[PDB]
Structures are given as structure tokens and as C-alpha cells.
Scaffold this active site. Structure first.
Site, short mmCIF file in Angstrom:
data_model
loop_
_atom_site.label_atom_id
_atom_site.label_comp_id
_atom_site.label_asym_id
_atom_site.label_seq_id
_atom_site.Cartn_x
_atom_site.Cartn_y
_atom_site.Cartn_z
N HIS A 142 0.87 -1.21 0.00
CA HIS A 142 0.00 0.00 0.00
C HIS A 142 0.90 1.25 0.00
O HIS A 142 0.75 2.27 -0.71
CB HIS A 142 -0.87 -0.13 1.28
CG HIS A 142 -1.57 1.13 1.67
ND1 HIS A 142 -2.94 1.24 1.59
CD2 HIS A 142 -1.10 2.31 2.17
CE1 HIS A 142 -3.31 2.43 2.02
NE2 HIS A 142 -2.22 3.15 2.39
N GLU A 143 1.82 1.33 0.93
CA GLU A 143 2.67 2.52 1.12
C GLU A 143 3.57 2.81 -0.08
O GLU A 143 3.64 3.98 -0.53
CB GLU A 143 3.62 2.38 2.31
CG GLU A 143 3.04 2.51 3.69
CD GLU A 143 2.04 3.64 3.78
OE1 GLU A 143 2.04 4.73 3.20
OE2 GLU A 143 1.12 3.38 4.53
N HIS A 146 1.73 4.60 -2.78
CA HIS A 146 1.59 6.05 -2.65
C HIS A 146 2.71 6.72 -3.46
O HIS A 146 2.45 7.77 -4.04
CB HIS A 146 1.73 6.53 -1.19
CG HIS A 146 0.48 6.36 -0.37
ND1 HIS A 146 -0.69 6.92 -0.77
CD2 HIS A 146 0.22 5.71 0.79
CE1 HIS A 146 -1.62 6.64 0.09
NE2 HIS A 146 -1.12 5.90 1.07
N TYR A 157 -3.69 14.80 -0.98
CA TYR A 157 -4.06 14.07 0.22
C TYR A 157 -5.16 14.64 1.07
O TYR A 157 -5.08 14.73 2.29
CB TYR A 157 -2.75 13.74 0.96
CG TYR A 157 -2.91 12.35 1.57
CD1 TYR A 157 -2.97 11.25 0.72
CD2 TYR A 157 -3.12 12.17 2.93
CE1 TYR A 157 -3.13 9.98 1.23
CE2 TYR A 157 -3.27 10.90 3.44
CZ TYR A 157 -3.29 9.82 2.59
OH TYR A 157 -3.46 8.57 3.07
N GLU A 166 -5.89 6.92 -1.02
CA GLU A 166 -5.84 5.76 -0.12
C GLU A 166 -6.44 4.52 -0.78
O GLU A 166 -5.88 3.44 -0.54
CB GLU A 166 -6.67 6.03 1.16
CG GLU A 166 -6.04 6.85 2.25
CD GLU A 166 -4.83 6.05 2.61
OE1 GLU A 166 -4.48 4.99 3.10
OE2 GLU A 166 -3.74 6.57 2.30
N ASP A 226 -9.22 13.52 9.84
CA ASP A 226 -8.54 12.59 8.94
C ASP A 226 -8.31 13.18 7.55
O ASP A 226 -8.85 12.67 6.56
CB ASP A 226 -9.38 11.30 8.96
CG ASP A 226 -8.72 10.22 8.12
OD1 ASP A 226 -7.49 10.11 8.12
OD2 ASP A 226 -9.46 9.51 7.39
N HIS A 231 -9.06 8.05 4.95
CA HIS A 231 -9.02 6.65 5.30
C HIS A 231 -10.43 6.11 5.56
O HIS A 231 -10.60 4.90 5.71
CB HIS A 231 -8.27 6.49 6.62
CG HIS A 231 -6.82 6.80 6.49
ND1 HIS A 231 -6.20 7.97 6.93
CD2 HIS A 231 -5.86 6.04 5.92
CE1 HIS A 231 -4.91 7.86 6.63
NE2 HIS A 231 -4.68 6.70 6.04
ZN LIG Z 1 -2.17 5.18 2.64
#
Ligand SMILES: [Zn+2]
Ligand SMILES: [Ca+2]
Ligand SMILES: [Ca+2]
Ligand SMILES: [Ca+2]
Ligand SMILES: [Ca+2]
Length: 316
Positions: A142-143, A146, A157, A166, A226, A231
């Protein structure tokens, strides 16, 4: 590091044994020279100063409990790199083989992992909420995804663009987990999340409302926390991606699943050809519909299921 490529062995966070690509030069370094410009793993040694020191080991065997998070960050980075290379023909996140760097043992009791704009950072967790975050192949993928988004569409973001951001990361994190065949599922971070509680996870793509996230656009979070629910409102898109692939009936809308390979291709194309920095859900639907059209034709089942899954989550 200037040395000789070699192969070492160690144990990951969950105790499994694996080989890793290392480089010898007096010490054995976590430096993989077989992928692009390199995969480099650093030890933050429980601090916040980044990147820390290139990981160095004396005999090329990584079986200590301190080594475990390093092993895994290095290996799953290698796996994610190969997914993107072999499945989408993309060489590293910048599409030019940029070196991939990770730091593990960041801080103390740190319950998260992130891409900081130049490298991956992994916490060790507190032992209750998390174990070392590099243990989850989907977390890693996942990271790193990005980093692919920053170099391509540039989704900012926050708000709906941040939620798309996300969701793309959960989508590609999940498909890397299937590509490695590493006990696959549609949940996010179940291999490291709450070690004393079996069957749970951070998020669910197949049923986001199980952990509190919205699964329809009418349920969307419209607050300011958030970063505008980046998220939270990602569950709307996750849910949609899950329907495209696996199919299902959701608020009475039936969708015929077209599989993970097609989902990946449709979303890789939208991501790298039609999405812009401030794209919203509606624009994502259009992009996705255009991508399936480009790939499979305007009257294919593939287009029909993209549209039906956006309709099932209320995105027009
Ligand atoms: Zn993320
Ligand atoms: Ca050793
Ligand atoms: Ca899994
Ligand atoms: Ca998973
Ligand atoms: Ca758990």
C-alpha cells in the site's frame, strides 16, 4: 555500497524463513542490486532521525528478532517492485528505476508506516495494536503505491482526491498480496494488526462497514477529521473495486465480477492516464469507464461491470 552481490537468509516478522538479496563489502548489507537502481534497507535504531544507517550484518544470516522487520521490509519491497515490473511494465515508482529505500525500527511503540515523500518508514508497533508493520505484504505494497501515485496522477491528500489516493494504495496492496499468493484476502493489514485478536483487520474492501467505513456515497463522511476522511471514504472505492473483481449484489445492484487482473489493468490505466491531482469520485468513475473502454471496448462486460459497481456504491 560498492561490493559483491549475494544472497542471505533470515526470518521475517511472522517467523517464516526467506532468502534476501544482500551485498558484501566487509559487512553484509541489505542492498539488493538485482532491482533497478537498488533496494536499500536502513536501521533507524528506535529513533526518528532518518534514514538511519544502511543495515549491516556480520555473517549474512538474519535470524535475530531485531532483524525480522528489516528482512521483511527488504523482501516485500522486492516483491512489490516485481509486481509492478512484471504486471504493469513499470520500473520502480518513478517509472525509471529510482532506488527504493526503507527505514525500520523507527521511534518507539510507533503504530504506523508511511511513505514520507522520499522513502518508506516502518514502526515496530506497541505489541498490542501492531507488531512490526513491515510484516504485512499489503501494508508494504500500500505505502509504496503512494510513491507511484505521487509520480503519476498526483492525487492530493485530502477530501475525495485523498480518499481515492488511499483506495488506490489498498487496491494495489491487495493485488500484490494475491500476486505473491501470500495467504490472500481483501482485508488490509490483518498479518500485523492486533496480534492477540484473530480474524480482524484495519479495513475491509469486501465489507468496509464491518470496521466502520462507508460502503455507499450517501454514507460518506463529510467532516474535517482525517484530512476530510481520506481513510474513511476510501471504503466506497474499495467496495467498488471489490465488486468489479469478485462481483456481488450490494444495495440490490448485482455486479458480475471480472477478476483481479482486469481490475488491476483498469485501475493502473486510469491512474497513469486519466486521473489528475484534484480528481473526485465522479471523475474516477469516468476515468475507470474510459480505461475499460480503451482496453476491452465500449460494449464489453468489462465496461458493464465498471458502471454497475460505481452505481452500486452510489457514484454517478
Ligand atoms: Zn495510505
Ligand atoms: Ca547475522
Ligand atoms: Ca492475507
Ligand atoms: Ca490483506
Ligand atoms: Ca489481529
Amino acid at each position: 555500497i560498492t561490493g559483491t552481490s549475494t544472497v542471505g537468509v533470515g526470518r521475517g516478522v511472522l517467523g517464516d524463513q526467506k532468502n534476501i538479496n544482500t551485498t558484501y563489502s566487509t559487512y553484509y548489507y541489505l542492498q539488493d542490486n538485482t532491482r533497478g537502481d537498488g533496494i536499500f534497507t536502513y536501521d533507524a535504531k528506535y529513533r526518528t532521525t532518518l534514514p538511519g544507517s544502511l543495515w549491516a550484518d556480520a555473517d549474512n544470516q538474519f535470524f535475530a528478532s531485531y532483524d525480522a522487520p528489516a528482512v521483511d521490509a527488504h523482501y516485500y519491497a522486492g516483491v512489490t517492485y516485481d509486481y509492478y515490473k512484471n504486471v504493469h511494465n513499470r520500473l520502480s515508482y518513478d517509472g525509471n528505476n529510482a532506488a527504493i529505500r526503507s527505514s525500520v525500527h523507527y521511534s518507539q511503540g510507533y503504530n504506523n508506516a508511511f511513505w514520507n515523500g522520499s522513502e518508506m518508514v516502518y514502526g515496530d508497533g506497541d505489541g498490542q495494536t501492531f507488531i512490526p508493520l513491515s510484516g504485512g505484504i499489503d501494508v508494504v505494497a500500500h505505502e509504496l503505491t503512494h510513491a507511484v501515485t505521487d509520480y503519476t496522477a498526483g492525487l492530493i491528500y485530502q477530501n475525495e482526491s485523498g480518499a481515492i489516493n488511499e483506495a488506490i494504495s489498498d487496491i494495489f496492496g491487495t493485488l500484490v498480496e494475491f500476486y505473491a499468493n501470500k495467504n490472500p484476502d481483501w482485508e488490509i493489514g490483518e498479518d500485523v494488526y492486533t496480534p492477540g485478536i484473530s480474524g480482524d483487520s484495519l479495513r475491509s474492501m469486501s465489507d468496509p462497514a464491518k470496521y466502520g467505513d462507508p460502503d455507499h456515497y450517501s454514507k460518506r463522511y463529510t467532516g474535517t477529521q482525517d484530512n476530510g476522511g481520506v481513510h474513511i471514504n476510501s471504503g466506497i472505492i474499495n467496495k467498488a473495486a471489490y465488486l468489479i473483481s469478485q462481483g456481488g449484489t450490494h444495495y440490490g445492484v448485482s455486479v458480475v465480477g471480472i477478476g483481479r487482473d482486469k481490475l488491476g489493468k483498469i485501475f493502473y490505466r486510469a491512474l497513469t492516464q486519466y486521473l489528475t491531482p484534484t480528481s473526485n469520485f465522479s471523475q474516477l468513475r469516468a476515468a475507470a469507464v474510459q480505461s475499460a473502454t480503451d482496453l476491452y471496448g465500449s460494449t464489453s462486460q468489462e465496461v458493464a461491470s465498471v458502471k454497475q459497481a460505481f452505481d452500486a456504491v452510489g457514484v454517478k
